[PDB]
Amino acid sequence: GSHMLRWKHTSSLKVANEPILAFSQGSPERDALQKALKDLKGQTEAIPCVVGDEEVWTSDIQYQLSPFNHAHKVAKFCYADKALLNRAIDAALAARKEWDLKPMADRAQVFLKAADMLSGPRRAEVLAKTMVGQGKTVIQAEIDAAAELIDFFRFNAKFAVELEGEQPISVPPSTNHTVYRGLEGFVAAISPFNFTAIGGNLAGAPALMGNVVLWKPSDTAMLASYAVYRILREAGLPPNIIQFVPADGPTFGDTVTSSEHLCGINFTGSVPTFKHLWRQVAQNLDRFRTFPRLAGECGGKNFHFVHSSADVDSVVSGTLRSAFEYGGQKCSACSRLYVPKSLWPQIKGRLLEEHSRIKVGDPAEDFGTFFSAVIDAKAFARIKKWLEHARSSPSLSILAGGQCNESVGYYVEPCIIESKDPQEPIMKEEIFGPVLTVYVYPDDKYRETLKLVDSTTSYGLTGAVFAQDKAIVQEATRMLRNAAGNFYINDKSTGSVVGQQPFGGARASGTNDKPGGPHYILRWTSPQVIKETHKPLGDWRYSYMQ
Amino acid sequence: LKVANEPILAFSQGSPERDALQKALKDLKGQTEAIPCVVGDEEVWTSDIQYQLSPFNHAHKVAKFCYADKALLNRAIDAALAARKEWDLKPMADRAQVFLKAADMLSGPRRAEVLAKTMVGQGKTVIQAEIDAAAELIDFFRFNAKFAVELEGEQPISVPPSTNHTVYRGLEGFVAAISPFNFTAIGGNLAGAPALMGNVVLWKPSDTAMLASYAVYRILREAGLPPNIIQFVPADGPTFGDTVTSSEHLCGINFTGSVPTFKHLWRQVAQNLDRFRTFPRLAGECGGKNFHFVHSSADVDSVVSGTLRSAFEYGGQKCSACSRLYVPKSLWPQIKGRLLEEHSRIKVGDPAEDFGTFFSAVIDAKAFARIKKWLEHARSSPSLSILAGGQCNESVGYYVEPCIIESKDPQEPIMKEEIFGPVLTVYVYPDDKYRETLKLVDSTTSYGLTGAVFAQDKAIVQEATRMLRNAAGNFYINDKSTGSVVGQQPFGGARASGTNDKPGGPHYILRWTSPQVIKETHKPLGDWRYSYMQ
Numbered sequence A: 001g002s003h004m005l006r007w008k009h010t011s012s013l014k015v016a017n018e019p020i021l022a023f024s025q026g027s028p029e030r031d032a033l034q035k036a037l038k039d040l041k042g043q044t045e046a047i048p049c050v051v052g053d054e055e056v057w058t059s060d061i062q063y064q065l066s067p068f069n070h071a072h073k074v075a076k077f078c079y080a081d082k083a084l085l086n087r088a089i090d091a092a093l094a095a096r097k098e099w100d101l102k103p104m105a106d107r108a109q110v111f112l113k114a115a116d117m118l119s120g121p122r123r124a125e126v127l128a129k130t131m132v133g134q135g136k137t138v139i140q141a142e143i144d145a146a147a148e149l150i151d152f153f154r155f156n157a158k159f160a161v162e163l164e165g166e167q168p169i170s171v172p173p174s175t176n177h178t179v180y181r182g183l184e185g186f187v188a189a190i191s192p193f194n195f196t197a198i199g200g201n202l203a204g205a206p207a208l209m210g211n212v213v214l215w216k217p218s219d220t221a222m223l224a225s226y227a228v229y230r231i232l233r234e235a236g237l238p239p240n241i242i243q244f245v246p247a248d249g250p251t252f253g254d255t256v257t258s259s260e261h262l263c264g265i266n267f268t269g270s271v272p273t274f275k276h277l278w279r280q281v282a283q284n285l286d287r288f289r290t291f292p293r294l295a296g297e298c299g300g301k302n303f304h305f306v307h308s309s310a311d312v313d314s315v316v317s318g319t320l321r322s323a324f325e326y327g328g329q330k331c332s333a334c335s336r337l338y339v340p341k342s343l344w345p346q347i348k349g350r351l352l353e354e355h356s357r358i359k360v361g362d363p364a365e366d367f368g369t370f371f372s373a374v375i376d377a378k379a380f381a382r383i384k385k386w387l388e389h390a391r392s393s394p395s396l397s398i399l400a401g402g403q404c405n406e407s408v409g410y411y412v413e414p415c416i417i418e419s420k421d422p423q424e425p426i427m428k429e430e431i432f433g434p435v436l437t438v439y440v441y442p443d444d445k446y447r448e449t450l451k452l453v454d455s456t457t458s459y460g461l462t463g464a465v466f467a468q469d470k471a472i473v474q475e476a477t478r479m480l481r482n483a484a485g486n487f488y489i490n491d492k493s494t495g496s497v498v499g500q501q502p503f504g505g506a507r508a509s510g511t512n513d514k515p516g517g518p519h520y521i522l523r524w525t526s527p528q529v530i531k532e533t534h535k536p537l538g539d540w541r542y543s544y545m546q
Numbered sequence B: 001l002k003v004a005n006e007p008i009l010a011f012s013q014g015s016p017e018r019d020a021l022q023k024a025l026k027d028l029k030g031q032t033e034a035i036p037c038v039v040g041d042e043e044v045w046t047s048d049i050q051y052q053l054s055p056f057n058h059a060h061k062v063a064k065f066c067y068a069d070k071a072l073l074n075r076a077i078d079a080a081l082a083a084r085k086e087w088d089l090k091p092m093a094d095r096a097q098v099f100l101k102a103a104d105m106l107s108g109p110r111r112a113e114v115l116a117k118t119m120v121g122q123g124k125t126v127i128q129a130e131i132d133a134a135a136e137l138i139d140f141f142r143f144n145a146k147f148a149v150e151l152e153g154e155q156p157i158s159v160p161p162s163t164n165h166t167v168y169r170g171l172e173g174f175v176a177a178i179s180p181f182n183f184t185a186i187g188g189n190l191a192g193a194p195a196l197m198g199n200v201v202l203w204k205p206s207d208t209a210m211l212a213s214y215a216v217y218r219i220l221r222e223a224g225l226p227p228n229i230i231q232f233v234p235a236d237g238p239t240f241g242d243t244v245t246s247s248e249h250l251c252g253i254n255f256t257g258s259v260p261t262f263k264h265l266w267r268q269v270a271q272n273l274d275r276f277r278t279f280p281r282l283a284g285e286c287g288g289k290n291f292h293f294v295h296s297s298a299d300v301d302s303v304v305s306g307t308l309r310s311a312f313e314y315g316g317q318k319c320s321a322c323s324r325l326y327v328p329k330s331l332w333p334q335i336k337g338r339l340l341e342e343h344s345r346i347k348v349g350d351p352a353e354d355f356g357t358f359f360s361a362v363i364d365a366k367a368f369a370r371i372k373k374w375l376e377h378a379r380s381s382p383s384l385s386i387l388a389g390g391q392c393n394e395s396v397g398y399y400v401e402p403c404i405i406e407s408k409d410p411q412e413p414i415m416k417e418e419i420f421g422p423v424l425t426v427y428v429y430p431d432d433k434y435r436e437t438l439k440l441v442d443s444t445t446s447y448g449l450t451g452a453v454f455a456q457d458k459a460i461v462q463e464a465t466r467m468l469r470n471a472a473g474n475f476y477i478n479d480k481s482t483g484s485v486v487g488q489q490p491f492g493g494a495r496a497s498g499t500n501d502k503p504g505g506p507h508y509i510l511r512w513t514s515p516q517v518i519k520e521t522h523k524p525l526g527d528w529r530y531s532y533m534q
């Protein structure tokens, strides 16, 4: 009855969150970052597509601009054509079996090594490239290109190594074992401009699980994205496991959804684009060798809801940060603030005072900058249109800000607007700019207003309640259960931390697969269960049949 | 929560379970149950009357039921949605209790009933009903309850001054559960697992399994399931799919059935994406063209009994059933002779009246006709030869004898296409072409569900295991390709065989929850500036 299949013991991994650095004067990390920023000033990196180990150039040349100094081309790159994308698919597929057969721990090692490189010798580089290329301030780059990305890599490695210990029951005469296979085919990873870390996770998590990936990074985050890619390769990622293939969005989507070998799309970006990809997969369902798995994290129209018992100062600082950090360019950013009439004079006064102290400027040159320019000309134009809507709409009034200037960078001052209409389009539609809308509700209608918070928008991503009354917190928590997948009590609606607040939400905000938590990796494995029986079978008949 | 698998009873002469089952069978002889749609606690009849027939005696209408129309389905959605918030707010343990109670009822006082209804209504023999309506269903309920209660213990890291907690919310909207004729347990799981996780469900049971499905439904209600959590809504297939995919509140489809129907539902959801409040989650377990691959070192008796069971139990009406057998030339005289001899002894007949029956009639006239077409194909094809069986007679029941066919063409359509009948095709390969044949096992079909390798050579087993990694989601070494046991062999496969969500394992329930993480901060927030800015 000897076992012909032998299964090895599964190991464990101890990881903790990457500490956030202070960047105090004279500190090594501040000195290193300043030097890295200096290294990037006046520089343009020519970034190729990478298929296997080959650097490939097409004639479709594109540029990434520095948002706060758009005269500065930080990168020249190119769009993969359909031929190159299909070549990348073929080469990835040819590399997949070997990679899938590698022990999980060996794949995890690549990501653990990459995390250590990001933590130490490459921290300043990835921070600086995120600052200059995406317009982030020091701390916004630090929580993203360093801490969050490092955390994704370490925590997903832990989750993946430990997943292999999740095994079924065996009863004599048989032994059962689950093999956590990668998906058969390739995964397309499509990442957004606003977080360097998201690109690394979208391509990296499926790769960890034995998949091969075509990664289309965001044009407006190309510089930092390529830095991450190179680090993964230096950390030991074999060729053809992640293909670095910037591309026109529609072209990329058309190509990957036309391949019989597509097994997954890991997407973060706009709802309409995700829906389009979902429809393309459905249209082509008959050609696929298996049913592709779509994961999408999309936008939000997120709320801070204030109860009369709230700590005012916390409401003010938490809301200023949530609404305006990184120019409000977060799917988690607060864009609607609900305030009870009893607290509005206090909160309005404080918001306006603090607003006047917010510095908008060049984040590389002036570390006093709270936030900088928005990402590109398209974002600037959209935000400008909303500011113009605020002036024209009889239900809207601009309380603070409203100015913008795109002469040097895509600069928009933080803007606070009051709406007298809780259903105004500005209360519903995601702007992705530093534009906060305030609705003041009578204290006596708090319950009815909680219903408005829940029903007004199509989104379900983040939200916060500020209140010190326990019963109120319990009630609001119950009522807003499906209004936010990441819900905050007396804290701001942004800044989820890996392993602490797994991130994502439903309604129109996506598929809610909770990257940052222990279950996300399950989307990228298709388990096989093996039963080995160690004794001969008996007759085909059963005893009761006699 | 601690749970173990339900014992499979032996049904020996004079045993309590055999006495009880015989009584329950007698109770159903000549009976027709009028089964209403159930919306909330309302029993509703439409004019669209339908009948479930006993497969082995189709003159016996075992149930009269009706199809819910679009109006009734929409009322069922409305009522379910209004009950969902309270149900979802219940502690996981309180929801689990309903399923644990139902499991105990199925194990004991209701075991004979659900077995008998599965036998008479779906044509199962004693043991096939036992492993299904009792053991597997009981196991789904107990194991999923354990998995769910334990899932609540999966919580994130808290760091002062904040506390983090995950709330495993049910999906917002309603789930449509669409279940197949062939296992009573699958219907219970498809509707029950989402309900356990705080969802509300429109359950469209299979027409041809209506009697046993309603028995399970009633047991759930008696076990404490509140009204409007699971709506019992038999319906015309296209009408049901059209209606649920047209609702802005659809949040999931839990489907087990044909590939084309699943694909159609997937396309309907995609067409209507803009209408839905959230992205619906589709789970589909579909068919297979499952293999038994034999190496020359195999134990022949195990190959023979395992293959006879896998190919022919329940008339081969399993997504896991072996329908292609690959045998090396060196063992073929043995395996052929033994298969044909044992074949002559297989009793096909009335499973209620004759416990000697190995398997009975196939499920309905449509199945009978499809299987007959394949038998006629076998008689026509120059590369196919019927070695044994091939007879069929639908005068009294939908009776098809077990059929064993040899193909000289490893790529014949019969080697590729799912028949869902008692039809085994054998391909004999030269011993020295064993590796080439292993590749054929993997490359021939579109499916990836179950398969077995019979071999007593470690190196061969290791090689075959690696080579067939994606040819089967449930892979067996020296055992038959059917009979997955909850908690032991979580079930499912990829390629064309479905989404592979592995019901029977700990992760399946994750498809039916959409987590929320709550962070509470216990100290004031301070300034919006950062120290490095000064």
Ligand SMILES: N[C@@H](CCC(=O)O)C(=O)O
Pocket (backbone or CB within 6 Å): A194, A195, A329, A330, A331, A332, A333, A493, A494, A495, A496, A503
């Ligand atoms: N998870 C990030 C937001 C990610 C995004 O904007 O897409 C946060 O909590 O702030």
Ligand SMILES: N[C@@H](CCC(=O)O)C(=O)O
Pocket (backbone or CB within 6 Å): B182, B183, B256, B317, B318, B319, B320, B321, B481, B482, B483, B484, B491
């Ligand atoms: N899981 C069952 C098959 C279920 C089905 O036929 O759909 C088995 O292993 O036999």
